Design a protein around this nucleic acid. Structure first.
Ligand SMILES: [K+]
Ligand SMILES: [Mg+2]
Ligand SMILES: [Mg+2]
Lengths: 95, 21, 144, 92, 49, 354, 56, 49
RNA sequence: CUCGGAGCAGAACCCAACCUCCGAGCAGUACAUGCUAAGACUUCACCAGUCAAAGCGAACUACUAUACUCAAUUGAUCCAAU
């Protein structure tokens, strides 16, 4: 990671992360399953359905992904007709 | 289970003659 | 000025053993997949064939006999040349079907062995039950 | 009040009472309720759409044979056997 | 619990075993059960029409 | 570590020295028959019956019914054997059986069954339906007097009441035609109760009909202690049980305490418990006959509630327990995106402070 | 890693929807024509092999 | 939010309301440099409007 | 040098050696091995992997039938072809 850029002296974003993960404003990260497009001919339908799921990351991964991205990516966005709009805010979450 | 009094209730191969090719 | 007759408990208690069964919401006993026969039924037709007699039982999954027809009964035996042949098995089906309708039993499962199912006796006994009104399959449980 | 309502037609009035007899109370009022939204507006809009659907269905007089529900299939067999137990008087 | 084990008649291997057993001999196997805790549902007064 | 068995272990009496000489099952059906017998025996280990079998009381059920009829077994057996010989002697009978064209007359079978095994079959079926458990708190009786209840439907048809056959409230609008075999000078009491109908109290019943001091079998001449009320099973409440209990009175009895005003349209007054009623009159009264049917709601029940009972109709609904979900966690690792929907109250977009 | 006895092929629906699925067939056997469920038309339709994806 | 701003005098309903009046009343904060294209009117609060 | 079964490791789980043995890198039958979805398991992390009620759509008139038989029978990302 570049903590202080030579031109601006500012922390940089790892763009590899942006290409693979969606960050919900609540702090959750959404990813796709590895191998979900690989050798489908030898995989069962149950396995293939699991591979198509959009799944959440754990705390440790979430902390790493937060460090590898700048604050711009953590802002609240209001994209029109956003598919993931509902998932940005948690509900009935105790601790 | 071994320790329990019901140990071996499912034994069945002593009731059948051994098979030899 | 409340009406005394309109005093109704918030929850209705129906103690009829058949109520949830007749609504097809009662649990069937699922499982037992590695053994025979299945337990997933409310009522089953069970036919007992002996050297001398033919008996057919309708019993609940809990093991209570509901209705029965046997060639041991004088009412049936007096009209039978033989109590052990195909005619006796067909007659038992006809008698049992009538008793089932009078008891309110319109559905049951029949769980024959492969040789029993292929036999002419059991085929004639099944036709008698279906002709008599009883359906030998049970409606599926409603889970939702 | 369904019977008094003059904005609905008389034949339609009489056919709605039969089809939706389970929604008419002792006083004769057809009661419709919607609780599917957070907003009173949408709840009222759904209730009003139900009224408009009832009148459309009654006037349409559809003769298309609808597919039998599973709960109805069992009742059909049960009704058949109840008719099969019906007897006639020995000396009428 | 421990229950009497009767195989399916279509299960050729198990059926062969039981037909070779000596008369009066019953096989036993361990079974695992779930005793339902709650009822399927309750009738509740919904209206007074 | 080992523990000795607490009793005889299965497959212990088998002699394993002479295994080759011991007889084998050889058939699936012979093993299954023995296996079913073994399953029914009591065991000292844990069994399915222990956890799922209904817990019957150890003491036997008290019999409160009429004495068994006395029969000469020798004479009966002689006559029965003679009849079979005559039937088998007929050549036409043998050919019909051999060619599988013979049939039994169902009407005659039912008539003989009603005289012989009918009562025990009715008792078995009444026990299964829970009538003895609810009406008499587990006490059983053999219905030795056949009772024939039929609801006149139309002018040319009847709806017979047997033992759990379904009869609709519309068919039961008027009192049924009750006929039983009774000697001259005897007295009888006929009641109709709804075991499941009661709305306010779970254990109570509704006394739909009560006829007392019936002379012989002339039901019309009996005293109308309680007038007839058609069944009113509430919508969505399920299938109810209505039982006709015939009683044989040793002597004339006074039912002034049980007298209900004519007409009786107060559900509080209709409230009735058969056990309490029989207990006070047990000394002079014995259960004789039994019939019952199964009744669910129909549109005629609305008429009963609105007009006869002058009350609003109670509607019920079968409500299932709410679905279980584990406690929501801040990071649901490896769970699909629909995890969040499981814990969402509403489906409409929320904007918070904005 | 072994003698190639089977091959993977693309079965194309004859309904004109364009829905395709991949099936395995013996190399020496004739082209497969199968009755397979087509989600686009929501009923079972005849499929015909068009191409060989790879050797299995 | 719109009703709350009107009740407190921060937005005047006697004149035409637009983005300028909403911004001048501190009702909404628009960020054109963050690809904001204006305000979307959302139904929350319709029952009490 | 990866994967599976057995012993060491006797009875919940786990457990090493250039320890002791045997295997795998497929094949065969389906062509609804369609879709969707509670609740769980998990090779000690992650990745990956595993089992599934109900439901939709089918099938069905009893071929131990609706998550095929089989123990392992296998390869991430980028990229390329389409
Ligand atoms: K009740
Ligand atoms: Mg783990
Ligand atoms: Mg299912």
């Amino acid at each position: 990671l570049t903590y202080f850029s030579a031109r601006k002296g500012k922390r940089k974003t790892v763009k590899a992360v942006i290409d693979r993960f969606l960050r919900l404003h609540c702090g959750l990260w959404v990813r796709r399953k590895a191998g979900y497009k690989k050798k489908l001919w030898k995989k069962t339908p149950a396995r293939k359905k699991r591979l198509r799921e959009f799944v959440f990351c754990n705390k440790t991964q979430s902390k790493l992904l937060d460090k590898m991205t700048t604050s711009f990516w953590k802002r609240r966005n209001w994209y029109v007709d956003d598919p993931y709009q509902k998932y940005h805010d948690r509900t009935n979450l105790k601790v | 289970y071994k320790t329990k009094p019901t140990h071996g209730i499912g034994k069945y191969k002593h009731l059948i003659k051994a098979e030899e090719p | 000025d409340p009406v005394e007759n309109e005093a109704v408990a918030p929850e209705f208690t129906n103690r009829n053993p058949r109520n949830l069964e007749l609504l097809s919401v009662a649990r069937k006993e699922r499982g037992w997949r590695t053994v025979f026969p299945s337990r997933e039924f409310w009522h089953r037709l069970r036919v007992i064939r002996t050297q001398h007699h033919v008996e057919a039982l309708v019993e609940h999954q809990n093991g209570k006999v509901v209705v029965s027809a046997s060639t041991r009964e004088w009412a049936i035996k007096k009209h039978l040349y033989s109590t052990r042949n195909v005619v006796a098995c067909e007659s038992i089906g006809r008698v049992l079907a009538q008793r089932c309708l009078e008891a309110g039993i319109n559905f049951m499962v029949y769980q024959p062995t492969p040789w029993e199912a292929a036999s002419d006796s059991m085929k004639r006994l099944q036709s008698a039950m279906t002709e008599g009104g009883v359906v030998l399959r049970e409606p599926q449980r409603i889970y939702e | 009040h369904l019977a008094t309502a003059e904005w609905i037609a008389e034949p339609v009035r009489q056919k709605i009472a039969i089809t939706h007899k389970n929604k008419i109370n002792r006083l004769g009022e057809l009661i419709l309720t919607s609780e599917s939204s957070r907003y009173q507006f949408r709840n009222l809009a759904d209730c009003l759409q139900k009224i408009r659907d009832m009148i459309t269905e009654a006037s349409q007089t559809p003769k298309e044979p609808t597919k039998e529900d599973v709960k109805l299939h069992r009742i059909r067999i049960e009704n058949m056997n109840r008719e099969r137990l019906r007897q006639k008087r020995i000396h009428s | 619990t421990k229950e009497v084990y009767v195989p399916h008649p279509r299960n050729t291997e198990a059926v062969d075993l039981i037909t070779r057993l000596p008369k009066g001999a019953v096989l036993y196997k361990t079974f695992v059960h779930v005793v339902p805790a709650k009822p399927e549902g309750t009738f509740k007064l919904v209206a007074m029409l | 570590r080992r523990t000795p068995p607490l009793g005889p272990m299965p497959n212990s009496d088998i002699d394993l020295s002479n295994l080759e000489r011991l007889e084998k099952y050889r058939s699936f059906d012979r093993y299954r028959r023995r296996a079913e017998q073994e399953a029914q025996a009591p065991h000292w280990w844990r069994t399915y019956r222990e956890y799922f079998g209904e817990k019957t009381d150890p003491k036997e059920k008290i019999d409160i019914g009429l004495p068994p009829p006395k029969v000469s077994r020798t004479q009966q057996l002689l006559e029965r054997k003679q009849a079979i010989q005559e039937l088998r002697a007929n050549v036409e009978e043998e050919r019909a059986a051999r060619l599988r064209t013979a049939s039994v007359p169902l009407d005659a079978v039912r008539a003989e069954w009603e005289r012989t095994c009918g009562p025990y079959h009715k008792q078995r079926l009444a026990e299964y339906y829970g009538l003895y458990r609810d009406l008499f708190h587990g006490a059983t009786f053999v219905p030795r007097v056949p009772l024939h209840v039929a609801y006149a439907v139309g002018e040319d048809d009847l709806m017979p009441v047997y033992c759990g056959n379904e009869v609709t409230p519309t068919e039961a609008a008027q009192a049924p035609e009750v006929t039983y075999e009774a000697e001259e000078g005897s007295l009888w009491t006929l009641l109709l109760t709804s075991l499941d109908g009661h709305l306010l109290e779970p254990d109570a019943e509704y006394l739909h009909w009560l006829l007392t001091n019936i002379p012989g079998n002339r039901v019309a001449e009996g005293q109308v202690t309680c007038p007839y009320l058609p069944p009113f099973p509430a919508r969505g409440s399920g299938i109810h049980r209505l039982a006709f209990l015939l009683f044989k009175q040793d002597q004339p009895i006074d039912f002034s305490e049980d007298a209900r005003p004519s007409p009786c349209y107060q559900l509080a007054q209709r409230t009735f418990r058969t056990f309490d009623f029989y207990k006070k009159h047990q000394e002079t009264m014995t259960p004789a006959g039994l019939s019952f049917f199964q009744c669910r709601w129909d549109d005629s029940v609305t008429y009963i509630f609105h007009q006869l009972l002058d009350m609003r109709e109670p509607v019920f609904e079968f409500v299932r327990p709410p679905p279980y979900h584990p406690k929501q966690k801040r990071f649901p690792h490896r769970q699909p995106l629909r995890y969040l929907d499981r814990y969402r109250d509403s489906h409409e977009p929320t904007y918070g402070i904005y | 890693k072994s003698k190639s006895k089977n091959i993977l092929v693309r079965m194309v629906s004859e309904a004109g929807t364009g829905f395709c699925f991949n099936t395995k067939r013996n190399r020496l056997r004739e082209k497969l024509t199968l009755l397979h469920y087509d989600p686009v038309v929501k009923q079972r339709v005849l499929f015909v092999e068009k191409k060989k994806i790879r050797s299995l | 939010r719109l009703q709350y701003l009107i009740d407190l005098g921060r937005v005047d309903p006697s004149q035409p309301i637009d983005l300028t009046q909403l911004v001048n009343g501190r009702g909404v904060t628009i960020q054109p440099l963050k690809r904001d294209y204006g305000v979307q009117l959302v139904e929350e609060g319709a029952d009490t409007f």
